[PDB]
Amino acid sequence: EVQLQESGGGLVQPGESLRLSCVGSGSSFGESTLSYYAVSWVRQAPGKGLEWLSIINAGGGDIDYADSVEGRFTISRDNSKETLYLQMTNLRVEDTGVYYCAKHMSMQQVVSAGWERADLVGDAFDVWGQGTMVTVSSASTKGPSVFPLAPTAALGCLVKDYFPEPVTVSWNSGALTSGVHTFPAVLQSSGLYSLSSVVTVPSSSLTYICNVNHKPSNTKVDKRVEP
């Protein structure tokens, strides 16, 4: 089918701008790419529900926005690149969250056939992106501090001090894909996040390493875990 991949988000100061991109790939029925359908942006603040922001039709018409983002945010699409955009301006702290790209079900045009749909349906979201996170905070970014948790049994990795989310954990490039438990992060008293990650191993020991990836600071650590 059609797949969607948001990108271009992270940490930005209040009152600043940021441009998210949504890239389409693959095709549904009749070789229909993303330019056959109408897309919306939908954001989710940490711990809350889904908020719809804006919609655009296949040809780029019938734009509309939610009152909360009207005037600040602008939707658009380069169908030649099968890409959507969201140009955010004057970013407020409550704009923080995971911004999603979501395709609408109904086919809106088939350009080579000379067929358009007279209306804009805006019906069910049958395809979503993995999401890209936007953190609006004037606090500076800081790299993660990682320390081992040496040893059925258990060996872990303690990512102690960083800001902001998210990080990416993967023990030995997905070697331990069973029994893992990357724990939800907490906000330490200092003000920087902390996080642990674990895996269960039996009496047999082989070397085990954890691969840490923190995008906003170009951080990538393959920390060891020997007894």
Partner: protein, 55 residues
């Protein structure tokens, strides 16, 4: 040459085709800047990924 002549709705658009899409329009047949279609016909198309049998 006609003694009389009047036009009537043989197949009322929305009521006649509940299970197909009727709002098809084309840039080939534009009316009022926007692109539309014939006034006496309907370009029936798939609805919900299905073109049910029609009679």
């Amino acid at each position: 040459s006609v003694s009389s002549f009047e036009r009537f709705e043989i197949f009322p658009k929305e009521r006649s085709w509940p299970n197909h899409t009727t709002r098809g329009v084309t840039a080939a047949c534009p009316h009022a800047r926007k692109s539309s279609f014939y006034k006496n016909l309907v370009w029936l198309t798939e609805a919900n990924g299905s073109y049910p049998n029609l009679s």
